[PDB]
Structure formats: structure tokens, C-alpha cells
Design an enzyme around this catalytic site. Structure first.
Site, PDB file in Angstrom:
ATOM      1  CE  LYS B 181      -1.658   2.561   3.242  1.00 21.78           C
ATOM      2  NZ  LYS B 181      -1.661   3.914   2.571  1.00 21.78           N
ATOM      3  CD  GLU B 184      -2.602   8.939   2.905  1.00 27.16           C
ATOM      4  OE1 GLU B 184      -2.045   7.845   3.106  1.00 27.16           O
ATOM      5  OE2 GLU B 184      -2.383   9.933   3.618  1.00 27.16           O
ATOM      6  CB  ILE B 236       8.154   8.469  14.839  1.00 29.15           C
ATOM      7  CG1 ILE B 236       8.339   7.738  16.136  1.00 29.15           C
ATOM      8  CG2 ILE B 236       7.619   9.864  15.123  1.00 29.15           C
ATOM      9  CD1 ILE B 236       9.500   8.269  16.936  1.00 29.15           C
ATOM     10  CD  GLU B 237       4.453  11.186  15.137  1.00 30.27           C
ATOM     11  OE1 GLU B 237       4.784  10.739  13.989  1.00 30.27           O
ATOM     12  OE2 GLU B 237       4.774  12.351  15.485  1.00 30.27           O
ATOM     13  CB  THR B 238       2.098   5.974  11.244  1.00 34.87           C
ATOM     14  OG1 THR B 238       1.414   7.228  11.112  1.00 34.87           O
ATOM     15  CG2 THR B 238       1.306   4.896  10.517  1.00 34.87           C
ATOM     16  N   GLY B 239       4.326   4.384  12.873  1.00 34.01           N
ATOM     17  CA  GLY B 239       5.139   3.197  13.014  1.00 34.01           C
ATOM     18  C   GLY B 239       4.961   2.499  14.341  1.00 34.01           C
ATOM     19  CD  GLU B 256      13.957   5.273   7.046  1.00 32.02           C
ATOM     20  OE1 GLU B 256      14.792   5.481   6.135  1.00 32.02           O
ATOM     21  OE2 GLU B 256      13.078   6.119   7.422  1.00 32.02           O
ATOM     22  CB  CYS B 290      14.473   9.009   4.216  1.00 30.06           C
ATOM     23  SG  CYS B 290      15.730   7.820   3.733  1.00 30.06           S
ATOM     24  CD  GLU B 391      11.951  13.411  10.497  1.00 30.94           C
ATOM     25  OE1 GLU B 391      10.922  12.955  11.048  1.00 30.94           O
ATOM     26  OE2 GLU B 391      12.606  12.729   9.654  1.00 30.94           O
TER      27      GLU B 391
END
Ligand code: NA
Ligand code: NA
Ligand code: NA
Ligand code: NA
Ligand code: NA
Ligand code: NA
Lengths: 497, 497, 496, 501
Positions: B181, B184, B236-239, B256, B290, B391
């Protein structure tokens, strides 16, 4: 033998000092053979765990151990191995006192433990990274392997010192600093190995021992920001919680949870060998070893005979004191664990399975006071039942039939677990076909139980994440760094002048 | 050039078929240069994601791809690489349209992507495991490497097709089945690479593409029981959320999550080189790549001069349409991202830092309609500030001073991140000392940005878990199985007869 | 005297300490005073053949070759522990036999311990590979086996160290071995065989042949039952050995020494470079295999460097290796000292300058030993025989150079390729030079280091193969591809 | 007289290739190349001199020292090696036909070859950038220790007549992938596909001097290729006598050697083997390429209880083997390579008779009219022999098998290992455990369990004992073309102060 314990430390070991719990709390340790209190140790606090972690970080940052030569780290790990052999007799007795397993099982354990340390000692200085052929001209590319950093290590009650060795050996060989917490109910050999490690001599803070199941101690060890790897061996529910906590700092995790390990016996197996190994798979350490085979899958043409041959031998298994040479199976570990096993027998009955033999506490006078449970065989069951889908971790096996090779594979893989399993057949080609299709970290062909430092061990699916033992085991304790040097640097001049 | 889009698929790809969303929902895709809608695609449902996962499992179990020879898998991965080069021009333009980066940056990307697929094609058949010297007489011990299984792959908006290549290439080379995926907001090149992969020819269900909000289908892709590895690149929050979900099935995770990458410039650096590479580090892809270097640490004796030299050049950076050859920096990706960058400037001010240059949306007529933000330099700040610790992922750099080598190391490591960084100094010995102490997955000595398929990339600390690229990257997609054969099995006779 | 009173005087063949088949013996000398210190068996070619046949028998029996790698490692570790246990006596024996200082022998024994330890740890770490077969329904694996029966011939410079480099991997991998130390320096090798016998190995696994008897070398290099011949020593002997090994297409491993260059740039740390030039030139009287006899120094510091070096050379303390104040001992033998003297004649004939040394010392306490003064030869160039040929003594030559490119070109203008150094504070430059030097080991701002963890060996005429490290182990292994067809079908190419 | 098959040689180069130029021999000497099917001259090529070989070696050294190829990125070298692979597939049809024309083997065998050759180049292309060395954990504080792998240098490569282009691919692919410069000399009697692959390699594009082709068997050419001081590795595949001479010459400069010298490959058939499979594979082992392939199984060891039935089944099938033109689809076995080789085979039948073995079938040139002009020899089975005989101890390299009986597993192993050779062999038995026990005890570089002939780029191939030194194919094969350099940096150098001040 209480004299084992007269000089054994009762405290935690933090930042180079044997210390009590911050709140002076203690826990009584029990012998499962007679349920008697044999020892009292500190029951640490969450603050004690934090302190050990901070001590490990401080030590790591100081570089005394992380920057030591790999050769020298190997020598120190080898000195630990030699301590284990030197104290083999007392360590074995202590493990038998604390865990209930037979003295012969504990001896074999100490031999294995020696070999685990020896293996990692020899591995310490054999690979520091690699040189990469850079695709950019006038650059040098290398990968340097460094200790992962600060590691927290939580071990289980089945084989406390063995599981500790699997974690401590690579951590020390690679240059990490560690904080270890053994099972609250079985800390004795772990305390002892820390005394031994202290004698060997490591920089202050390199190794730390936390004791207990104090509120949030586990959460600190899994969720602290200064940890780089959390390595946990134990129950699936606790493991998942640990991984969720590790996420808060994006921390590496290594997990070994259990598994429902299948034992597949074809009609062309050596029949007497297969019965012998089904017994061994089901009942070594009262079925509590991580390699235990509780799920027997036997081909239908020999199933009836196999069931009876197994039962004939189960009836003769000698239960008793692990210190007695005639004992073949000791007690289970605790009241809670025995209760879980008893509730599972109720489940088996409710689902319509048959308790073919065992299934209750033994009555005999010398067994009355201990946490004994009869070796048990459950028949007439199927893969849809809870008793087949859920691991009991006790001296209990289920028996299912199968018609074809394809069916045996399908049934064996119809599980949430993926740790280990066996195939028995004189047709080695068939055994190899089955082995390649089983989603298990270890497949034994005409054997049951073997594991050793030279090969990685761990699970597919819900049995875990990562590996212990072998080169892969060592790799959990390393981190890769790509250092790229431009040896003829030129301005890029992408942006305007 | 919207003719790029006239035959581009608008659908998901599940189990070998281009399909709409189960509820026919769609999403409008935007060009950040002018904020115009350029394309409309399916917005899939959580049931669509489940279906793709189940299709990947079915395909995996069928063995058509997982049991294909490694050599043949390599040929098919190589055929993908060749498709990328064949369609380099249109793919580059599509990436520029979707992401806003310059056409030259997209071209470099496509060359890199070709090389990623080519590297993994060549690696596919180079290691099937190992033979182990068993410590048990009359046993054969081998470690066989198998595909990890079913993998879910979630990619970000910064380098959509590049990040896709890093995940797809090893997954296919090793024989896994995948469900991917893309972000979006940037799906176009990913759709296109799926059309190309379909042309190459893979067994049905081996590759599947889901489109749409991570907030809908993300939980399914991270928490489904049939997944063996979840590989996520993004915030980071999603990870962290993804890892917590993966824990429910004890699922391997590879993350990552970016990082605050330091750029350390000593007073004995080649000054003009260091300024050039600071610009490049700060502003390539508007500071959204990145590998971006947003945290400059410059030795105090050259700091004042460095600050001005940097600013002198920042003032000349040419913003514009990525399709125009004179453009040096394109817009940022979305309204939401630009708003975050603007809020960070407010933070910088509130904390007492100085906006030395930039810090706002540009006024120029040809830039008015796009998501542009001026290249920015923030001075007079320190490591305690949010703007240094957090960041922004935009065309913004901070500048901190340092006095000593030790101080530079301490500051650079004073961060939750650990992805990449550089050291600039003509004293290569000093650069190497610094590199060895930096807790970063990649350290460049007198360079900034390089990454390539031959070497692993990933972060220490909160920048991630695991590695992409290199042999280590391939290893995320493999699982080890120890097969132990007893070649002269004898009864153990531990239990009574 | 008690040091030798219980030391065996015999060969060791098929588990027994035996005399030579013809009872011949050889007198072993101490190079410090040229006195006979010990008498040992001088074996025959039939003794060597018998040891090789014993090694083959043992290899075929499988007792050691089929032992677990983990157990072989424990046994190799036990050897390492013996070396440390007997460190003092072994060091003294090496000094007595070879003349090097006791401090050098101590360092050696510490290293030898670490060599056995390294290989003990490596023994069980890699048994081969699983291959991803390109043929469906086949399994492909590569199994690593011991190479087989190996013959091992060692030199006089560091007898027990060189023996350790060969024995450790051979045993770790499961081979059976026949070793022959230099005829002039067998003492520590006899001792290590006593220690290995104590550790306990199957009969025939290890065998020791002594001497330089007629055709003994030829038997060890040319026997049909040998699978690898590993030789360390002179270039002329090595070439002969390789030619003999060809008669049975036998694997060879050779370490033949080299002219090791020491490149000193004007931006080197000056005092470091002088110190290391001395160490490179004169440790073990310049006889160690890592010795640096060819100094290349940048022209702008050359005059100052030459004088600093000479000032220090004049103070080097020659004497008995057993005396703590000794900095340099004698050379190994009359033949070797004669080769060094002939080289000084060559230097003079070519017009080079003997800046210091170049003769036997006069001092009374040095008169009876095989001493030769530490020597510096100046005003020479790469066209000279003295620069093109290695003498392996306490002698260095000094050549100047102007540029980095020139230093590289000069250093590579040699038949050898063993080791060398680059001294410069400019690490980027040192790395450039290191990458261009055709040498198995390059030191940046150091001289002499070698260790079990990394392979050592030479490019060009300095050798074939590697010793130490994983590559060193690999000389003692052989690969076997076992391919199983798990669904065999008839091919039906030929008519029915 | 024109026919479409002439397009095959019409544009093929007749020259050597030295330092980027197609050149004649220094003395303009030539050699006539023959088709073994009809003994007709099919092509004429340069026959180089020893000075031509020296010149090629000096050109390779110059190129190697220039660094254009040795310092090229490994990735880029891999792309170039892959381009070669693609050329092979592109020209598969013509290359196969040319190999059949030059060597006599069937067109189906040549097709399979070209597929293999493509895969060899592809395997090495993929390997080129996958390992540049190692970081070592130094035991000395304040030092960095690394091992960098470099190309070995200038390599000479001498290939045989059996599978000329296949054997060339095994050598060229790793040499180029690693950054070496090479000088190759194919068999004087079979140079055609090797010339063609040099044309193809030149198209791909390599720095001048990186690749060089010498042609012939000129006086001392071999000696220059094995004994020149500028060579770093000599890789030779061919006869044992030549290989030994080559190794002795290589010693004069202490030069690395890699040798593949063939072998007497045993085919062990137990009474519990799949009988029809074993007969089929015994035929395949004995007679593919008329028994001239390096993997040929000329030594059959069959368990005594099935030996009589096996011998007759084998003979019944041998009588039906179809000999003929390799270009004809019905041909099952082509001619042998040359007059000298056929004579060696005929002299070996005389030896067999003198020793008291029985020629059970074949053992002579065929009579048939269409076979009369070619170098044909009947597929042959020799029975009633034992391990003491020369016919069992010496490899003939022709369409001949010997059959020995054995009683026990232990005996089969003993007999199979009673040989100077050690290249490859097979064990046939439905008892996989037994086959594995036998495989572990055989002193052979490759052991097949219920198969015969497989080799492939992913796995190393080479011999124990007199069958060779070193390996080709696989990672080990690449490693012959690399050399290790330990670079040790002291990052905090201190004076030692051993010598007094
Ligand atoms: Na898992
Ligand atoms: Na940025
Ligand atoms: Na992390
Ligand atoms: Na010397
Ligand atoms: Na050489
Ligand atoms: Na050989």
C-alpha cells in the site's frame, strides 16, 4: 541439601553491588517437590530496574566493555564457561532444588550450559563486519558491526540457567551491557551465575540482576528509553505486552514464547523408536521443557497399536524426588501451573476427548506434598478442540490420527505456533518432504528434543520473533553501521552560484 | 503532461485482477506544484486489504512462487529492473507530477531503482543456508533459509517508487507473497510499477496493490493473522501504532521512521565543499528525502563564516516547477505538510531561535498556487529546543556550534533518532573517530546522501527496526529452519519398561 | 641444563617416540656461543614414508576426521592451555635454540597460545552451505571436509610460532599431519609434540620427522598419499617442493618471505618512523618474516632520517638472548651469517655505501657467537641486486623518493609481495598507497603486526595461499557438492 | 557450393585477439580446423607464436596496471558480464551449431550447453558486487583491521576440446567479474566458439588489453602462458600430463594454479536402486558426448545380486544407440573428437584384451556407410574386470564403460576410492540414508545421489587427488580470481622504544 544455600546471595546485583530491594521487600522461594520454602530473596522495585538500566547505559557509554577487544571478551566468556563446569555439581543440585527436574536432567543441562558459553566465547572475535564494493567511484564502503547497546533479558522458569546462558553469552561476547531478570519463582541458579560472573570480573554496570515480579518491573525493562533490545522468553500473553511496550521507543525485540510442537509418526517409522521418543517428547521435565512434544500425529494404520504401546509405558513412568536416582519424572513447577493443567483436563472432557491414562494428581504418600501430576495421554480428539489448539505446557500429550502425508502436514501446521517438531519414518525422502513444509524453526527427522549452541532456535508465527543460538543468535546483539568515505570529494553544484 | 495518465490504471490490484474498491470509493490525487487534481483512483476498504492478504497466503501456500528456483526468481526480478529502465522517462515524469520533485531528481531515482532491482535479482540465488557441524554424533544439521511468508509493505510519500523498490525487490527475490500500500497521496508510480510487474508475469496472488488511507486499512495490514512480516516506512507515530498492532500475532516488524540527521563540520573541513554539501543535505527534495541533513553542527571558529556562506547560497536557490530544467527546489508535498512546517517556524520563534533566511511561503506569481516554502536557515539555537530535537522534514536546517570533537559527538548523539549523518574534516583519522562514536545506521565521511543497494540502510533508536538494502535487507524476507536428521537413531530408554 | 634433561631426542611416528631407522643423529647448536646443546635423531626417507602412511591410516580410520568439530576445538584449546602452562620453559628453549631475546620468546609464546585459541574457537563455526539448486526437485549442499593428509615443513626463524600456524588449523579441521621442523631448530617443536601427546589424539593423527636426511623433503612433498603440502621457508626450496607436489597434483601452500618495504613520507611522525624503522630492520636480528629491510624515505627528510637511524643503530645492544639488556641476538647459523657477508660484498661491488655495521662484532663476549652488526646501507637504487634480493638479516637499505607515485612504483618493483608499511600523518594518502601496494599485509603507521584473526601470505614470489584467519583454516578443508535428485525420472535419451 | 549453413562461418574471424586488435600470427602461420563427423576441413585460423603469447600477457599487465577494468566498480563489471550472458542467448542458435560443427556433439547437447553458458555468465554477473572483503575485530587496541579482496591480477586460461565454450565461460566469467585481465588459449583443434565469444565480448566493450585470445599449439606457447613472470594465476583444464607440466612451470614464479584434469568417475548401483533408472543413467553416464564430457561415468560398480541382469539390460540398450551426424535430430551419439583420440581409445581396447577383460559389446569403429568417413567409435561395455587392471585404473575419455561387481556397501566405497582421481561420481539406491553414507565417504568433488551429470554455476566443481587443484563455479570459483590484502591501521601509534636512546 540446604548447605547449597548457606553462602548463596539473597540480593539483586546492580552497578557492581549486591543490593536489597529499594523497599526491602522479599519473596519466599519454594521447592516444588514438597512445597517447602527453601530460600528468601529480594523482591525488587520498578525504581531498582530503572537504576540497573541507567547503570548499564553508563557502562556502555564508558566503553570499558563495548570497546574491549573481541578476543578478550571471548576469553572472559570462556572463563564463565569454565566456572560452570567447575561448579557443575552444586549448580545442578541447585537447579533441581529450585525447579524440581531430576538431577540427571540438571547435569545434562550444566554440560549444555558450559557448551553454550564456550560456543559464544569462540564466536566473539570471528566477524567484525564487511567491506562493500561501492558503486560510487572514489569511495570506500564498509559495514561495521557494533554491540546493539543496552539489553534487557527476561527468562522463564523452565530451564532458568540454560535460558539465561542463551541470552548472557552473546550479549557479553558482543560487548553489550545487560540487565537480567529471572522468573520470580526460580532465581537460584541465576543468582549463582551472577556470583560467578562477578568473580570472572567485568566492568561495573556491564551485568545487572533484578529479582521479582514487582509491579511495573517488566514494563520498565521493556519500555525504558535507554534500552536497545528487549529479549524475552516466556508466555505468549506477557510477550505480546512486552512487544507493545517496546514499541514506545521503537525498540528491537526478540521473543521466544512457547509452542505446540508436533510429533509426526508414519506407519513406516521404527515403531519402538517412535514410542520411546513420544514418551521422551511428552514427559521430559514433566512436559515443561520448551522443546516438549504435546501433539502427537500418528498414521492411522498404526494408531491403535501406537496408542496402547504409549499407554503401556506411561503407566510405568517413575515419579518422585528429583534428587533420587530412580526418579524419571519430577513435579510441575507451581500451584498455578498445576491448576492450569487440571483445568485443561476439564476442558478435554467437556469437548468429548478421552483421558486414556493419568489426568490427575498422584495419591502415593511420598508424592502427596509435592506438585505432582500424572503423565497423561488424551485420545479421540481433533484439531478443532481447545486441548489440541492450546499448549498446556505439562506432562500431557494428545493423539490425533492422519491418513496421508499431505494430511499430516496440514494438521501439524494448523496451529498458531511454530517452534519445533519431529517426523518419524524410515523413508528419509518422505521425512525430508514433510520437514520442508512444516512451518517450524526446528524440524527433527527421527529424533526429538535436540538443540545446541551451533544452530539457531526460535519460532515461526506466534512462537516468537528472532533467534537464539548460532550466528543468528549472536546477530540479535549486534547493530550494523555503514561508514562511507568519499576519498576524492568534489562539490556537487546542484544549487546556484 | 497529463498524457502520462491516459492509460494509467485507476484501480487496486488484488489476486491477479485490477479491481475497484469494494464500496466504489475514490480519491483525488493532486500535483503539489499547482494544487490541481491530476488523477482519480480507487480508495480501498479494510475488506479489500483482508482479501489481498488472504490471496497472498493462498498463493504462498500453492508454492508456485515460493518453490520456484532462486535462479528463476532472480531472472524475473531482473526483468522488472529492465522494465524500469525501459520506461525511465515516463516513470520519472510521473514521479515529478505526483511528488513535485525535479525531473533531474526523478531521473536519478529511476536509475537508482533499476539498480535496486538488479542488485536483488543478482542476490536471489547466492545463499540457501548452511551446513552445521553437529556436536551430536551420527546427525546431520543444516539451516535452510525460506521465504518469511506473506508480507505487508507500506510506503511513504517522499520517494514512493524508490521505497517501493526497496521492499518489493527482496520480497520477490526470496519467494514471498506481498501486499503493498503506497501513500494515499502519491500512488501513481506504484500503480505503474504494478502494471509492469504484471507484464513480467507472476503467479496470481504473489503481488497485490491496495490503495488508500492508512487510517482505514492500516490496522488490517499490520494486525492480520496471516501476515508474517510487516514492513513500514513513514512517520514515527504511525510506526509505533503499526508495531503495537503487529504484536497481536507476534509478527515480525521492519520499520524506517526517518531521523534528525546531523551534519558535523569541523574547522579543518574543505570549507566550500562543506557549504555545498550542507545545502545539498538541507534542500534536496525540499528537505523531504529520508537522508536530509536538517541539523548542522559547525565548529565555532568557522561558524560565523559558515552561517553567512550558507545563507548567501540559500538566497539564490531557484524554486519552481519540477518539469522546468532551471528549477533547483520544488514544492513540499501537501497542505498538511506545509502547515506543519509553518507551525515549526512559530515554535522556533517562541523558543528564541533566529530565522536567518526564508521561513515563509514565497510570494512570486509562478509560485503562488503551489505548495512552496522558502529554503530556511535557523540560527541561535541549542539542543534543548524542540526545533532541534524534532524533525520537521522540510526545507529547513538549524545551525548549532561546537568547540571540541567530544562536544560534537555528544550533541549529535543527543537525539531520539539514529538514521544517518556526516562528518566533514580533512583529518580523516578524526572523521573516523567521530564516525565510530555516532549512533547512526549510516555515517558519511566528506559526503552527504549516499545510499545504495549494496549496503544496508536503517536506524538506531527511534529511527527504526531492521535494515533495508544489502544482504541484511534480503534477510528480513527470510526465515531460518534448522533441520536435524539422526542417521543412526537409537532408543533413549529414559523411562521404564 | 635441566631444561633439556627430560626433552625427547626422538621422532614421533604413529604414536611412538622412535629413533631414526639408521640411528643417525644431529647435533643442535646455540647460535650465541656455537656450542652443541642437544642431540636428536636424524630421520630417513623411509621414516618420513612411514609417518605419511600412518597419517593416512589414521585419517581413513575416521577417529579424528569424524570426531565432532566441537570436540576437535576442545582438544585444540587444550593445546593452547599447555602452551600457557609451559610458557616459561618454552620461551627459554626457543631462545636457546634460535638466539632471539627471551622477551621476544615470551611475546611469541603469548601469541602461540592465542593462535591455538583462535583456531579452537573456529573449529565448529562452518560446515558448508545449502545451495539453492537451479534444478527443480533436487537438494544441493556443499559439505566441507578435512583436506586429508597434510605435510608441514617449518622454518628456523620462529619455529614454534610457524608450527602453531600449521598445526592449529590442521587439527581443528580433522586432518592428520606429518611435520618436519627446520633441521637446525627442532627443540620447541619436539616439546610441543610431547604436549600434544599429553592432550591425547588418535594414533597417527600427528607425526614428527626430524632432519634434513636424503630425500626426506622429497618424500614429504611428493608422496601419493599426501593431500596438501604446506611449506614455509626459502624461495629456492619452496619452488622445488611445488614441482615435486605436481607429480601427484597435490595442493600446495607456500610462505617464502619477502623484501618488505617501509615507506616513510616527510609528513610522518619523525621519531615514530625512526623507532619503527629500527624495529622493522632489527627485531630478531632482522630474521623475522615480517622484517622491513627496504626503507623508502621521502627526499626532504632523507638526510635527517639517515643520521637519526644511524645514531640509534650504533647503540643497539648485542648479546646473549637470556640477558634482559640484550636488544639484538646473533643470527641463526654459520650458513646464514655467510649469506649476509656475501651480500655486503655485493653491496660494495654495486657502489652502495655501508653507512654503519656490515661486519662481525669484535667484542670479547660476542666473539664466539654468530653475531653480525646491525647494518644500514645507503646510496643505493632499485636496479641493484642488494635492493632486489632479500638477505633476511640485520640489514636495511635506504632509498629516497620524491613523490607518492614514485614510492609506490619503487615499492612494487620487486618479485616479492608479503608485507609492508606506510608512515604518514596524512591517513588518506597512506590509504591510497596501501591500496596500490601488491602485498598481503599493509601497515599504516605501524610495523610487524600479524595475528590469528587475519590472513597472512604473499602476492607474487612470496607465496601461494594464506595462513591465519578463516582463509588459513580453508587451506585444510575440501568442498564436496552433494546433489540429491528427490524425484528422479528416466531421461530416455538413448533408444529402447 | 552455397547452402544456408555457410552463413555460419562466412563472417567468423580467423585471427587472434591481442590488445584490442584482431591480429594474425606473428609469422602468418595457420591451422586447419576439422569437423569430426566427416573429417573435412571447415575453417582456417591463425596459429600463434610464443612471441604473440608474450605480447598478450604484457598487454594484460599494462591494462591491469592502468586500472580501467580493475578499478571499475563491481556493479559495473557485473553489468558488462551480464551483457555477455545476453549475447550468448541472442546468438544461441548459431553458437550451438558452431559448437556441433567443431566438436561433433549433438545439436540438442549444444543447445543445452548454450543455455548453461548463459546461466554461467548470469550467475557471475550477479555475484560480482556481493563481497569486497571483511572487517576484522583486531586484538590490538587502537587499530582497525580489514581484509580487502582484489582481483588476483593477470590470469592465463587454457581450455579443452570437450566443451570448449562452456569451459571458457567457467573461466572468463569470474575473471571479468573480479576485475582481472586475461589471456585465453582454447584447444588448438576446437577454437570456433571461443573466437565467436571474443567477437561478442568485443561488442560489449572492455578496456584494451583486458581480454586477449591466443590460438594454437605453437612451440612453447603453453610454456609462456604457464611460466611468464607477469602472470598471477594459471587456470588449466585438460590432460593430467599437461597439467603437471604446467604446474611445474608455474612454480618458477611461485604462480597460483587452478587445475581441472578429469577423472575416472564411478557410478555405484546398489541392488535396491530403481533398476530402469540406473540402466538409463548408466547409459547417460557412459555415452553422452561419446563419453568425452568431463562428468562421464566410465566406471560402473554394480551390486552382485543384480549384476547379471544389469549387464544384459545395459548391453541390450547399447546395441540400439544411434550414432550419426550431430546436426540430425535422431542422432544419440556423435563421433569422437580426433584421430589421435580415437587411436588412444583403440589402444585401450588392446590393453583390455591383454589384461583378460571381456569386450562385451562395441570396441571398434562402426562399419555403416554414413559413418565410414567420420571419427566414430562404437559405444562399448567391458566386463569381467577388476580394480588391479589398467583399463579400470586409467581413464580413456571415450564411449567406453567398465563393469565391476561388489558385494557390500563397504566394498563399493573401497573400490570406488581405489583410484588416483577424485572428480565426480554417483550412488544409485532407493535407500537414501545409505546413499548419503556412501556420498560422505567418496573422495570426490561432486557426488550425485540418484542422478548423473548435474553441474551448475551455483555450486563449485573440481577434483580431489589427481583430478585437480582448486574449484570452478560458485563462490569458490570466483575466489580463485581474488587475492586478500590485510590493511591494518594503527590509530594511536606510539613509539615502542625497544632499542636504546
Ligand atoms: Na512471529
Ligand atoms: Na528536512
Ligand atoms: Na530501534
Ligand atoms: Na632483515
Ligand atoms: Na604467488
Ligand atoms: Na589435487
Amino acid at each position: 541439601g540446604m548447605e547449597l544455600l548457606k553462602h548463596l546471595s539473597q540480593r539483586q546485583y546492580i552497578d557492581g553491588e549486591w543490593v536489597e530491594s529499594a523497599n526491602k521487600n522479599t519473596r519466599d522461594i519454594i521447592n516444588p517437590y514438597n512445597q517447602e520454602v527453601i530460600f528468601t530473596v529480594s523482591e525488587g522495585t520498578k525504581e531498582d530496574a530503572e537504576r540497573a538500566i541507567l547503570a548499564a547505559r553508563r557502562a556502555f557509554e564508558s566503553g570499558e566493555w563495548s570497546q574491549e577487544t573481541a578476543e578478550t571478551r571471548g576469553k572472559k566468556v570462556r572463563a564463565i564457561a569454565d566456572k560452570i563446569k567447575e561448579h557443575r555439581e552444586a549448580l545442578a543440585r541447585l537447579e533441581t532444588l529450585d525447579t524440581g527436574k531430576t538431577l540427571e536432567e540438571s547435569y545434562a543441562d550444566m554440560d549444555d550450559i558450559h557448551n553454550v558459553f564456550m560456543y559464544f566465547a569462540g564466536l566473539a572475535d570471528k566477524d567484525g563486519g564487511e567491506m562493500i564494493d561501492s558503486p560510487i567511484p572514489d569511495t570506500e564502503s564498509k559495514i561495521v558491526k557494533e554491540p546493539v547497546g543496552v539489553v534487557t533479558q527476561i527468562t522463564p522458569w523452565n530451564y532458568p540457567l540454560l535460558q539465561a546462558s542463551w541470552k548472557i553469552a552473546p550479549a557479553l561476547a558482543t560487548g553489550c551491557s545487560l540487565v537480567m531478570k529471572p522468573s520470580e519463582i526460580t532465581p537460584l541458579t541465576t543468582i549463582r551465575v551472577f556470583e560467578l560472573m562477578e568473580e570472572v570480573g567485568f566492568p561495573k554496570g556491564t551485568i545487572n540482576l533484578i529479582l521479582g515480579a514487582g509491579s511495573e518491573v517488566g514494563d520498565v525493562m521493556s519500555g525504558h528509553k535507554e534500552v536497545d533490545l528487549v529479549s524475552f522468553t516466556g508466555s505468549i500473553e506477557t510477550g505480546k505486552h512486552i512487544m507493545k511496550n517496546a514499541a514506545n521507543n521503537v525498540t528491537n525485540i526478540a521473543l521466544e514464547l512457547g509452542g505446540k510442537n508436533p510429533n509426526i509418526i508414519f506407519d513406516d517409522a521404527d515403531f519402538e523408536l517412535a514410542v520411546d521418543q513420544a514418551l521422551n517428547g511428552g514427559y521430559f521435565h514433566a512436559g515443561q521443557v520448551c522443546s516438549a512434544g504435546s501433539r502427537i500425529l500418528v498414521q492411522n494404520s498404526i494408531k491403535d497399536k501406537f496408542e496402547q504401546a504409549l499407554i503401556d509405558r506411561v503407566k510405568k513412568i517413575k515419579l518422585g524426588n528429583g534428587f533420587d536416582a530412580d526418579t524419571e519424572m519430577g513435579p510441575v513447577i507451581s500451584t498455578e501451573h498445576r491448576n492450569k493443567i487440571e483445568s485443561y483436563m476439564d476442558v478435554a472432557k467437556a469437548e468429548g476427548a478421552t483421558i486414556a491414562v493419568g489426568g490427575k494428581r498422584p495419591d502415593r504418600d511420598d508424592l502427596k506434598d509435592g506438585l505432582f501430576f500424572e503423565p497423561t495421554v488424551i485420545t479421540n480428539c481433533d484439531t478443532s478442540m481447545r486441548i489440541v489448539q492450546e499448549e498446556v505446557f505439562g506432562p500431557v500429550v494428545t493423539v490425533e490420527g492422519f491418513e496421508t502425508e499431505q494430511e499430516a502436514i496440514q494438521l501439524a501446521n494448523d496451529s498458531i505456533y511454530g517452534l519445533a517438531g519431529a517426523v518419524f519414518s524410515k523413508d528419509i525422502g518422505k521425512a525430508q518432504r514433510v520437514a520442508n513444509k512444516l512451518k517450524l524453526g526446528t524440524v527433527w527427522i527421527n529424533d526429538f528434543h535436540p538443540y545446541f549452541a551451533q544452530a539457531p532456535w526460535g519460532g515461526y508465527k506466534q512462537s516468537g520473533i528472532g533467534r537464539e543460538l548460532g550466528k543468528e543468535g549472536l546477530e540479535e546483539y549486534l547493530v550494523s553501521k555503514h561508514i562511507l568515505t568519499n576519498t576524492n570529494p568534489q562539490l556537487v553544484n546542484w544549487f546556484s552560484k
